[PDB]
Each structure stands twice: as C-alpha cells, then as structure tokens.
C-alpha cells in the first residue's frame, strides 16, 4: 500500500527504488539510442541538444518573454513572485494557459521520449515557466521531486519524469541545475528536506554534475533524482520551461501523508495527444 513512506519517523533512511527507471524494452523503433536509454537508467538524466531549430528556439524565447513581461491574461493563482515583491519568478500550468507551451509539451521530440521512458501514454502532471534573475538569483536546495509528489500529491510510483527546456543559456557560473547522478535509485525518506549526512553520503558516492547548454537544450530527469542549484550573482539570467510527464497508469491517489492547490499537481487524466512538425 505504501512503497515509499516518508515524513513518518524522526530518523531518515535510504530505501531501495522498487520501480524501473526505463519502463520500456529498447528497440530500433525507440526515439533514443540504446546508449541514451542506458545512460538515463544508470544516471537518471540525459541531455538532448540541437533538437529544435534556431527559429523554433527564438520563438519559444519570445513566447516566454511575453508571458513573463505581461502576465495579465494568466490566472493570478498560478504566479509565484519574489517574496516581498511583485516580480515574477514562476508561472505554473503554462501548458494549460499558453498555446505555444501546450504545443511544446505535445511535441513528439519531447512527448515520444516520455512515452518510451515511462512505457505508457503520458499526461502533464505539472508545468512551470521559471525566471531566475541575474545578481540576486536564489538557490534551490536539494530535493527529490518524487518525495513531494508522493507524500503531498499521492503519486504512487516512480514513473514520472521532468524535462527542462533551456530558454536562456546555462553556464557553469549562473547557478545551473546540479544533480547527483545515480541518486534516483535511492529513495531518501525525509524526517520534507533531505538531511545533510545522507546528502554527503550520496554526493561522495556519486559526485555532482551540472548540465549546461544553449537555449533549446533539454535536460531530462527521473522524478526521484536528487537535484538543486546554487544562487546566481552573475548578470546572466536563467530561464526554462519545466514540463513534468507522468504515465496515465501512475495517476494520483490520496496523498501519502496529509500534506495541495490545483496548479501544483493535476488530480482520471486523459492522454496527451502528440504533435509532429515544426513549432513555427
């Protein structure tokens, strides 16, 4: 009934993953190579580069820029601002509010990779457009999305993944996403913030990596991969569209705790329909 209990004890534990990472047999018909599929399984993330043309990228950048600069058509409940400020940091449900971001989410270059990796038809569990300014960019402390999705949203199994489509360049210096590779194969119960000693143990065993890339680069990661980012004092902003794909068969139950709003988690979802062709 609960494969992954967390936030119950006062002590934390490292429990085993009890789900596959790659949920399909690999064949010549798969949308990624046999090595890509093995890398995702072993590391918990892969990077897709040069999949969108320069015109497609510029178009996604313009759409995102317009959303961030002009939020007025959006649902106010979906907007996350800097704490004592009206400056936008995230817009949730972008796949539902923006025709361009709906179309991005449905695009075969993304969604068929999801359907392969998750061995199922898929739907959008959550989406967000994120903007982290230069100079006063904040850190995002280490977490596994799955531990939250499970405890708070009722997601039963590790059968979801996130895709980050970079809309502003990530360099080594502007606080890119950092992951602990292979950490997805351990479920770290929380006492919902993972503990220092277990993070030190994961990082010593697996190291840290910070995928970088130019706008249009897609960073794909397993729902349970341990990740976070440093802050950003550089003048160079970070911006991405974050799409969470879940298998339709892993649809949410009652929360495995008592611990949320509409827009954080889609609570019988229908299958995403895949679109083929250029975005513009």
Curated annotation (Swiss-Prot):
The record marks 149 as: Important for ectoine stabilization. InterPro entries: EctD (IPR012774), Phytyl_CoA_dOase-like (IPR008775). L-ectoine binds at residue 126. It catalyses: L-ectoine + 2-oxoglutarate + O2 = 5-hydroxyectoine + succinate + CO2. SUPFAM superfamilies: Clavaminate synthase-like. It is an enzyme of class 1 (oxidoreductase). Its cofactor is Fe(2+). Its EC number is 1.14.11.55. Optimum pH is 8. Changing residue 148 to A: Strong reduction in the production of 5-hydroxyectoine. Keywords: Dioxygenase, Iron, Metal-binding, Oxidoreductase. Optimum temperature is 40 degrees Celsius. Active from 5 to 50 degrees Celsius. Belongs to the PhyH family. EctD subfamily. This is Ectoine dioxygenase.
């Amino acid at each position: 009934q609960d494969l992954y209990p967390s936030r119950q004890r006062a002590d934390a534990e490292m429990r085993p993953r009890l789900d596959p990472v790659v949920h399909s047999e690999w064949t010549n018909d798969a949308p990624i190579s046999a090595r890509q599929a093995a890398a995702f399984d072993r590391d918990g993330y892969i990077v897709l580069e040069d999949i969108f043309s320069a015109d497609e990228v510029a178009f996604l950048q313009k759409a995102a820029g317009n959303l961030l600069a002009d939020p007025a058509a959006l649902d106010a409940d979906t907007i996350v601002t800097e704490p004592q400020s009206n400056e936008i940091r995230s817009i949730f449900e972008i796949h539902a509010q923006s025709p361009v971001m709906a179309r991005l989410a449905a695009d075969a270059r993304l969604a068929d990779v999801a359907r392969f990796l998750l061995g199922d038809e898929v739907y959008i569990h959550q989406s967000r457009l994120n903007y982290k300014p230069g100079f006063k960019g904040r850190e995002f402390y280490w977490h596994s999305d799955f531990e939250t999705w499970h405890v708070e949203d009722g997601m039963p199994r590790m059968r979801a993944l996130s895709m980050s489509v970079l809309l502003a360049e990530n360099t080594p210096h502007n606080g890119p996403l950092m992951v602990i590779p292979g950490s997805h194969r351990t479920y770290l119960t929380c006492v919902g913030v993972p503990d220092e000693e277990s993070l030190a143990e994961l990082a010593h065993r697996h190291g840290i990596v910070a995928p970088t890339g130019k706008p249009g680069t897609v960073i794909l990661f397993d729902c349970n991969l341990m990740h976070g980012s440093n802050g950003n004092i550089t003048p160079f902003p970070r911006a991405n569209a974050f799409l969470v794909y879940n298998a339709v068969s892993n649809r949410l139950e009652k929360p495995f705790g008592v611990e949320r709003p509409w827009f954080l988690a889609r609570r019988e979802p229908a299958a995403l329909r895949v679109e083929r062709g250029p975005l513009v």
